[model samples]
Structure formats: C-alpha cells, structure tokens
Target: GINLNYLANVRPSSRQLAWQRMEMYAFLHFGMNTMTDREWGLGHEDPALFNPRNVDVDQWMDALVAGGMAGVILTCKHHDGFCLWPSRLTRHTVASSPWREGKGDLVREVSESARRHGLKFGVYLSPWDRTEESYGKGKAYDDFYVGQLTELLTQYGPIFSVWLDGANGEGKNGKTQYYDWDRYYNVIRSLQPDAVISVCGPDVRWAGNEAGHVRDNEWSVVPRRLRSAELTTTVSSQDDDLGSREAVAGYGDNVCWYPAEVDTSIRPGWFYHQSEDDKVMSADQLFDLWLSAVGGNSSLLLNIPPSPEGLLAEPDVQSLKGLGRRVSEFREALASVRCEARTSSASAAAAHLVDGNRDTFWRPDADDAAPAITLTLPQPTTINAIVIEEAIEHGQRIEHLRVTGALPDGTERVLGQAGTVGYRRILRFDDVEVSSVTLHVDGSRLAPMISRAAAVRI
Candidate 1:
C-alpha cells in the first residue's frame, strides 16, 4: 500500500491554486536590456537611454487578452537593477528617463491598464542588482532591497504574484551578494498575504528549464524543508530537476505542495531585438508549449517582449491570438458524453469523472486494483486529444494507464498510453473516430482517484 502520509500531506495552498488557475500569463521583460539589445545590462547605462516615445500599456494588455492569457508579470526590475517605477532608494529608474518627461511610472501604467482590462497584475524584482553600490555590503544591501520591495508591494494595486530569482552575479564591489530571502518573504507576506511568491520563495517553483515543457510525471508535491542553507543551491535548484521525472515526483519523502511554473519566451530572447522579429514562436509552436505546460498540469508564463518602442510587436500579437484561436478550437469541440466504469466501486460512480468539477472524484473501492471507465458519445466523435486529471488531494496515484476506443464495428483499438496522471495528463495522438472510448487504469501505487476525463478534437 502507498504511504498515507505522502497523500495526506500533499495539498496545495489557496494562493497556489489561484495562481495555477490562471494557467497562462505573460512575462514582460522590459528594462535597460530591451533598449541596449543585451540579455544582461551593465548598470552603467544612462537613465536617459530608457526612453519609449510610443509606449502603450493598453496595447500590451490587449495583446495578452487576445492571446487568451489571464494576467501579466512585468519585469519591474531586472538584473541590471533599472527600476521601472521611481524608487527612493535608487536613482536608476524611470524618474530620470525622458519618457513622459520623467513623470511617468511604467509600473503604475501597467497595473491600472491590467485592472481596466480585467486582468491580474504581478511583478518580478530581480535580486541581483549589478548597479547598486551597496549590493554585497551585507545588511545595507538587504535593507535597500527590502525598502524597494516594500515600495513595490505597498504601491501596487493587489499584486497577484511576486517573482524572485537568485541570479546573484558579481556586483560593482567585485563580490557576489547574499540575499535576505527570509526578510524579502516576510515583507511580501506582511503586505500581500494572498500574493504567490515564486522561483526562490515558498509559494511556487520553476519548471526546471526555460524550455517550457512539463515532465510526463511531474508532481507538485515536494520536500517541505530546504536541503541546504545555500540560497540558490537549495531553493532555485529545485527548478533544475523539474525535467527529471524521478526528481519531480518527490525529494526523499518529505513531501509538500510546491507546484511548478513553466516559463519560456515567445521569441528567442527575453527582451526585444530587431533581429529576432521573424523568430517569434508561431501559433502552432505556442499551442504545443501550452499543452506541455498548462495541459500537462503546470502554469505557463509565456514571455512576450515589448519592442524598444514600448509596445507589443505585430508578429508577437498575431501569434498570441493565433495560439488562442487554436486552443479555442479544441475547447469548442468538447462534448459532455455519458461515462461509465467497468468495475462498480462502493459509493463512487464513474460519472464523477465527467462532472466538470475537479473537487468531485471517482475512487476505487479496493485499496489496490486497476479499474476502467468508458465514455459513450451521442454519435461517432473524432478526437486527437484526451485529458485526464487526478484528484491530487489524495496524492498522485496512477502510474500507468491506457486509452482504448470502441469502434462502430465493435473492434477495440489502443489509442494512447500514459506514464503518470498527476494534476492532469494530456495524451495526444493522430485523430481517430469512435463511438465510445475506455480508460484503462492499468496500474497505480494506491487506490486511484480521478477527477476528470475529457476528450477534445484538435
């Protein structure tokens, strides 16, 4: 029997659930890097260089909404330490820029614009500040960073998430800096209790790579305590193992709910470059990424860099809408069909899997046994994708599964095989026509619990 301790301890917090529900969001990596055509800024650039003559926050938000994204996480500050909002602790901000005659706050503009468009707003404040002289000065730098964070948290209107990365590079003082993550976390929790702190914080985790693909067996439950005292070693490194199925399942048994967030850019770079305008990910490519991330049971943070002119490029905007249109096609083809299971479990019906409510689940009466569910459509339906979701409140139980279709001629055809069904598993295959389909729960570590079984045409 599977250890009940692991199952009982693996439950997501409210904030994590809310963030995951967004499924898709945008990452705006605008800063000095965007203007200088560099991935990492030297912090020596003049604030006057941060000019955007035709910046439009409404256009940015509109592009995201059209792309079917739920929110935006602006790079309020990048590794270059350039602040989009005017910070009292640093002169490296828009206040010294020529944009809007040095009177504009890009952060404020994006925040209000997001609200006006009915989208959530989040912030990414890079801890590695290459420009701040006090950086690497221990407590002095910590206080400075905390002050800036406080200003961002207090000034913003209901920030949804706060992204913190441990990109600790050599500062101007020729030394690597140490961050007070505890203090930073404390500030965020105190000011914004509902906000999810991601990457290096407690609330969320990275999906191991910048490729934006979730592992076949990705598990949100992970070790509750840090494996080491080192910040990047213990915290950020959690992301490095997201690609490995063994590591993602759990880290030596001390499990807790720490879900993965898959981040990748639509273009090759996080910041805009004229040379890469033709290199933006096509709508088809974005949908593949969406399936691997959100469809594979993780959140997708897709980066859509704004051009140096301070607006979403036409190529990126069009691709976003294309991805949305393709996704909508499958969603529109979903049908509520009759579902029945082969084995009769005590007090549990197979219909629960098709009820469209994640909270309701179908469980096997026996603690150890493989069961199956069959879905009967009104007529012969053609589908290319099958999405199954596990009731993870009881932990990830299913290990191996298969889907078989019942043709009108009464022949059973093996449609797909899956490795694991955690929060969700999406199986894709060449399109097939069938009057009915059966889900064979071939094996599991415990009594399997399934929340949903959906078939979609693509």
Candidate 2:
C-alpha cells in the first residue's frame, strides 16, 4: 500500500503553533495602491504628487490594536513599480513627495508607529513594476526588487513578514519577467535572519481569497512550486479552492511554512474605497470569523484600510475595535472551564471544556481517541461567563448546546441548554457560581466540533 501516513511520523509543522495560538494580524494596502484606484500600483504617477493630504500613523496603530490584530504589512512597492519609502537607489518614493517637502519616509513612520503600540510590522514589495524603465526586461527588475527588499529588511528594525505578491509576469504590454524564488529567498534569509516571509516566501502565506471562514480540513497541495506570491490560501492548490467547499485530502500541509493566515477585508475592497464605507462587516460578522478562522485552527488577518485622509473611518474603528473588545471579554471570563471528548466526525466532533469558552476549539480527530485531553483551569477560580464556538464550514452549525457541571458536593446540576451561536457565541449565566466545572456527555450536540469551552468569574 502507498504510504498514506507519511505525515504521521513527521513532527507537526510550525503552522500548528500558529493554529493553536490563533494569532490575529492585519494588512495595510498603502503606497501607490493609495494613488491608483487599483489593487496594484502602476508606478507612473508623478513622484512629486505622492503626498497624502492627511496621514496619521498613530490613529492607524490604534485601530489595529483595537481590532485585536497583532501586526501589519504595508505596501512598499506595488506592481505599478513605485516605492512608498525613500529609496537611495530610485526616484519612485516619498522622497520626491511634497507632503513633507520631499522628506517623508512612509515605511519608517509606519514601523515606528506600529512598534510604539506593540505591534509587529512587515512590508509588501511587489516584484512586478509596470512603469519602471528597467521593469519589463529580465535581470534588471530582479536587481531592483532585490535592492528594495534589502532596504526594507535593513532599514526596518525587525520585520515579521516580508510579503512578495506574485501578481505579474504576463508582460505589462512589453515588460514582464518571471520571478526567481531561490534568488529572492536567499537574499531575504541573509538580510533578515529572524523575519518570517509570507505568501510567496518560507513563513506564513495567504490561504486564497476565501474571505469567509475555513473548514478544519485545509488542503495543502501545490500543483507547481509557488513563485512570487504574497498570500496563498489555506491549501496552496492550482485550483481556486474557494470555488467549492469539498473535503479534499491533505488540506494545507504540503509546503514547509507557518500556519495559514486567513485574510479577509472588513470592507469588501482590499484597498479603501469611499463607496465601500457603508458595507463593512459588522462586529458580529468579524467575531464570528474570529472563531471560524482563527479559533478553528488558523490565524486570522483582517484588512482594515485607512481612508485617503489617513485615518480609519468611524465605522471601521467602531466595528473592528468592538470586535476585539468582545473577544477579550469572553476570553477573560472563559479561561477556567473543563471539557470531555466523546465523539468525532467531520460534521460533528464531541469535546467539552471546563469553565472555558466552548468556542475555543474543535475536535477534528474524532475517531482517534489515543490522546484526548482534559483541560483544567490554570488556577483555582470562580466561574460566570462562557462562550460557545462552532467549528462548521463557513461558520454554519446546529443550534443549541447542553451544559452541565459538577459542584463541590459531588453533585451535577443541569445548566440547561442554549441555542443559535453565530460563530463566537457568548453564553452567559448568572445563577451558576462554582470554583470548578466539568462537561458531561449529554445527548444534544453543539458544533461540527467543540472549538473551546471555559467559564469566567463575575
């Protein structure tokens, strides 16, 4: 028999840590993407006019922290071939802008501001520069891209990710060159020894455009070695995996990388658009996504772009900040619960948490019960608040959960049942006060699998 258990003996990938921690991050589509109404900059804009009427790096960092995201990757050079920061080697930067009298350095400001607020910082440098004199031909643009990458790595103190988006190489009319992965990786590893490259590099990557939620099964089959791309989907397959929600074998395990980061915009557009202001996702949607994407077993990266005025819109601020607060509130309350695993399946795996958020995790490996875990509070504590999360695809799930716990007298009380947990369902109770709790195998099921469960003190 062909060895289907190849990965069994292999140690869990770095991505496993990312998945377990459920790290939240952000992406800033600044730079020429700011000037062009397009996703990729065309690099032909007058460098003199590259000034933002109003830019506030502080406000952006505030929004990022409030959104519960831990980092940002700003656009340095877009496919349009313009650099956002001052470049000693090129004229396509803020160095030519009248914003600060040609003295502004965008990446510098972004790095400083983000670091001040305790957030990781990164840069996106698109290899395809359509407007550069040396862009279209081979070897020349490679040097240009490498030089830009070097500057970004050395100039910035420590970059969490160096994003390389492979959105070009088909020839922008006459100038296009395929990327050399080995050359780029070698340069990045040499320059930023500790930095984690993403999407197109060795570290974390995009899990496609499935902006919704990812299922537990992330297929990681790369038909061809991915070259210069910023974020690959949960599974790096040639097929548009998002076209369907089928359960394919080996979801997102092929490449040697950190966990997949599911990137979805708060607004529909990746970049800021005035018309999209009214259409951003609500706190509920975002919170639901938190559980479905990050809580389920992956990192969640929400894109919240600043408007042209250089500040987060009121809606973006209110919605994203509110989402973070909500998550933290539950996390604070549901950290002490315990659970018992009883069943397992792709549709519904059975596991319970103690005083913890039922929404914290899922049990995908139902059939194999060799290592079922019993979660306990890290300390002795009172319990009051609890959150129930569902691990369904796109966050769909069966309504209703049955909760029961034991008391000091060694007696079990039926905590009754609740229903309709969106994605991150908050189930609060006032009557039950206990130092400890346990999950019993009741008949009713709550999720495809229990992602997490815990209780909080009042």
Candidate 3:
C-alpha cells in the first residue's frame, strides 16, 4: 500500500529550500553563438569569429540586477564545444580566440560580476561536445568531458547551479557519446556542494519547454523514478502529470523534492539576434511571466542574451526596468492585512497566515478536508490579484482552493479558484471591491496547511 504519510514528509534540501526563495534568475546565452549570429554553433566555427569589439560583463549584471533577478547562469560552453573559460583540457576555448588578445575569460568575469552585484552565479555546459574528437569513444570521451568539467568547477567561484541539456548530436567520429552523468554529478558535489545540477542532472528539472509557460498546479515533490530515461528531449513527464497520487502510487516510497525551472528567452531565440531587436518582450509580458512562473510554485529562468558587443541591448534593458517598476507597483496591494478564521480543527490559528512567515502555518485536523478561512479587512479594498501559499515544507496537498469576497452591498462573489497551492500560487481576476474575504479549501489530499492568503491589486 502507498504510505501517504511518508509522501507528505518528503522535504527539500537546505540548498534547494534556499534556491526556491530566490524565485527568478537570469540566463546569459553569450559566446560563439552571439558573435556568429547563430542560435547554435556546429562546433567548427573559427576562434577568430568569436571576437566582440567590447566585452562588458558589468553591464549585463546591472541590467539583470535592475530586473530583480537573483542569479545568473552563463552558458560557459554550448554544443559548439567553445569554452568561455580557458580550460587546459581543451584547445577549443576563448584562449584560442583573438578576443582581448586571446586572454579573455568570460566565465571568470561573469562569476565575479554576479557576486559583486549580490547575485548568485551558475554555469551551463553542454554535454554533446561536437568539437571533441574523443566523442563515441567510451571512457576516452567521458574522461575528456570530466576534465573540462573539473577545470570549470575549480576555476569558477561558488557555483550555485550547473545546467545541462540532452542535445545528442553526432560528433567528429560520426557517432554520439554516452554522457558520464554520475561522474559529472560527483564533481559538482565535491567542488560546489550547494550547487544544483539542473535539467539533465538530478536536482532541478526543465518545465517541459522554452516557451515560458507555467503549470497552474506545479508540484515540487514528484516521483523519484522519473529521474531515469534522459537524452529523450522531453525530460519531464512524457504524457501526464508527474506528481499526482496515481503517478506516485505506481512507485511507492520513490519520491523526491525535485522542483521545475520555467525557462524562456526575452527574444524569440535563446541567443541575441539583431533581427529580433524590435521583438523584445514588453514589460507587461515579462511581468505576466513572473506572475505565472514564480507565482505558480516554480522558479523562472528568463534568458537575456547580450548583443555582439557583449552588452545588454537598450530595448532589453528598458523592458527589464519596466518589469522592475511593475514589481514595485504590486507591493502596496500585497501589503499585510488582518486575518481571522473559523474552522472545526482548532490546533492552529489562522492569524499565523498573516504573520509574514512562511515557516509557520495554519493547519486544520487531518480529516478537515474542506477547511475554510475568512480574512477580514479593516476597510473596503479593491483588489484584482490574490496570492496563496502552502507549507510545501510538509508536502504539497491542496487540490482545489476557492476565494470569495464579501462586497459592501452584502453579497458574496467568487474572486478566483486554483488547483494546487504549492510553495506559492497567484490567482488573478477583474478588479472588485470588498470589505471581507474568505478562502475555501474546496478539495485537498487530507487537510491543506495554508501559510498565506492575501489579496492584492496589481
């Protein structure tokens, strides 16, 4: 029999928990692709073509910081096998390029810039090295790949994340190579213990696509067995939700806290393209993505590729500034409001929901499946958005949550409804004025322990 108790107790690592709080990060897809005006390099581009007139890592950092990003993950090496850093294990690197007289190291500059801007730094190294001659040669390729990884791990500062993709392209030997995933993970663990091995690794997962779409009921605790079967492009569940009761029941006692990273680009392409300069995502567009991804219990990794000059384009920077302003615009509406509750289970107080602490929560009895809480406001407030959070530290359990408001005219109207309340969930509706509000847990796994339920006008 499946033990629901054990499943409910699944928790994230200390590092994972800390990462979840960061919420939004920036992805820098700069390198051979940027200068060559290509989204992906075929691993044979000349090093002389990698030269950018002026490389400014600080400029990129300033734009990212202004955009309210908490971290940056530079594509240290894409599938082209071009290393941004000078690795002794490979000749295909910036060291061979004419950039800065063949002495430039983008990885070092980017890592240092992120740290100076109070943001965490991470790296993305593609496993399918199309340039290396050892590909498809068993341990020879694995050893070569591991050597490159070792150099990156040792040279960079504290690595917060290591992103990998399952891009299996035939290499110089006319065959694909099998990745030494365990060896790569061991290196990351030994060098950067706090770093998350994302996507093709074992820690964070890709949220299905690069389209920036977020799941309405994103669940962090998913079936552990799903970690197998890589290199399939569809790293996530092939045809169904990965964390539902039916999904987990098939693999009893095999579940882990593996969260999703909703990734997409500001432009249509992951790398910068002058042709798409006029197509940068608007501030509102980016804010909507923020609301959907970060607000839907998943982290957002928005790519802002630098131009050929190694600078964030003016349009991209302007949109980021606008997004920052939009984030500020929502603070007042989401400010703390007084809360009270009436429920059959009395072990916890609903006041805890308004305490501004995610650690403390209000939990009804285990059998109180439809627990409801009525939040009272000191005065009538017009709101268009509502933010709810579940004590995901315990485990994701809420199935359906409904929010209703008490109008001044003595009528109650439903404000919004949601499927799952993981770490956080944001529900949006047309602006409405109400004196009091109530949150009803219409459905749940057992009893949903709510940590926050506040209405806001955005």
Q: Who wins the TM-score comparison?
A: 3
lDDT for model 2 comes to 0.61
Q: Give lDDT: candidate 2, residue 111.
A: 96
List, residue by residue over 122-142, the lDDT tens digit for candidate 3: 989888777878877878988
The reply for model 1, stretches above 4 Å from the true place, is: 171-174, 225-230, 233-253, 335-348
lDDT of 2 by residue, 53-82 (tens): 689989999988998877888877777667
lDDT of 2 at 129: 71
Give one digit per residue, the lDDT tens place, for model 1 in 377-444. Answer: 67787877788888875567676889989888889899989876777787888899888888888877
TM-score for each of the candidates = 0.92, 0.71, 0.95
Q: Give candidate 2 regions above 4 Å deviation.
A: 2-5, 12-22, 169-174, 219-258, 338-458
Q: Quote the lDDT for 433 in model 3.
A: 91
TM-score of 3: 0.95
